[PDB]
Amino acid sequence: HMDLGKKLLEAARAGQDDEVRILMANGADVNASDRWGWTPLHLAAWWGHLEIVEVLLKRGADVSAADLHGQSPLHLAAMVGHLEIVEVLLKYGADVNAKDTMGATPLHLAARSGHLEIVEELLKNGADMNAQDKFGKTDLAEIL
Amino acid sequence: MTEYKLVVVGAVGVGKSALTIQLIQNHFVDEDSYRKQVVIDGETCLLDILDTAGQEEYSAMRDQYMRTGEGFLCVFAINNTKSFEDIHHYREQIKRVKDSEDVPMVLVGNKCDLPSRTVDTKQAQDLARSYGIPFIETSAKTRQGVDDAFYTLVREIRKH
């Protein structure tokens, strides 16, 4: 009666590739969520486990999964500054303009967190930007 | 006199109560009040401290602390990875309860004297930079960082 979803979440947090793949081979739900609505993909994105993000995406992780705060894995990677993960999530069809329950897009969060390269990567993928997307303490030709 | 309403948040077992007790205590011991009068930068003021310990799971009461608090000490334990990510959830909830992206907060990495470290200093410094907040490592047992954490939070409230 071991909860495989719980074990998968723990493995994703830890960045344990072996455990993640063994659990998914045993049928562990790739989109299982914790009490806050974080999935293994949310965990891998926030913690910066690129290898795990790729593994989960290959096995049908939902890139659009929204937690209790309305945040998707793209919101998390954009806020904490994981550029390679932002790129992979967008490649797998992440909604670039998804709004959380504060009304924040991933670009809004990246801009406030001072992650300019991420803001530009989001803009390259069709991100909306407006005057309320203020910058914190911090190609260009393609965007312009 | 100026009062500063400070709320200590974080997962069960991160040392919230121990940190608060260490700040409040007026003598070493191997009953007291959480309204403490101090002098900070020349001015007599009151630290009005609320500890969430005992009600971390109690959603309705967590939100009540977040409404009344002027600044938040966001405590994780350096040997508990879950407690570190929980800071994200607390910060997002504070933003929503207070309807603001600019709430005074300090990230506190507690139990910094323990050898069993699972959250790197670099990860915590980087997260604090993304959040736009100070980061302080603390240990009540070795009396490191505790005064700095609370003093720094008061300074964040004053700057707001």
Numbering used by the authors:
A (entry chain B): 0 to 137, 149 to 154
B (entry chain A): 1 to 30, 37 to 166
Copy the relevant paper text:
KRAS mutants are major drivers of cancers, such as colorectal, lung or pancreatic cancers. We report here the characterisation of two potent DARPins that selectively bind KRAS on a site of the allosteric lobe, encompassing histidine residue 95. The DARPin binding inhibits KRAS nucleotide exchange and KRAS dimerisation, thus impairing mutant KRAS–effector interactions and the downstream signalling pathways.
However, the exact conformation of the switch 1 loop in the K13- and K19-bound states differ somewhat. This difference is most likely due to their different crystal-packing environments. After K19 binding to KRAS, a small but significant increase in the dynamic mobility of the switch 2 loop is shown by the increase in de-protection observed by HDX-MS, and some small perturbations of the effector lobe HSQC resonances are observed in a few residues in the switch 2 region. Nevertheless, HT1080 cells (bearing NRASQ61K and KRASWT alleles) expressing K19 present an increased level of pERK and pMEK signals. This result could be assigned to the inhibition of the GAP binding on KRASWT by K19.
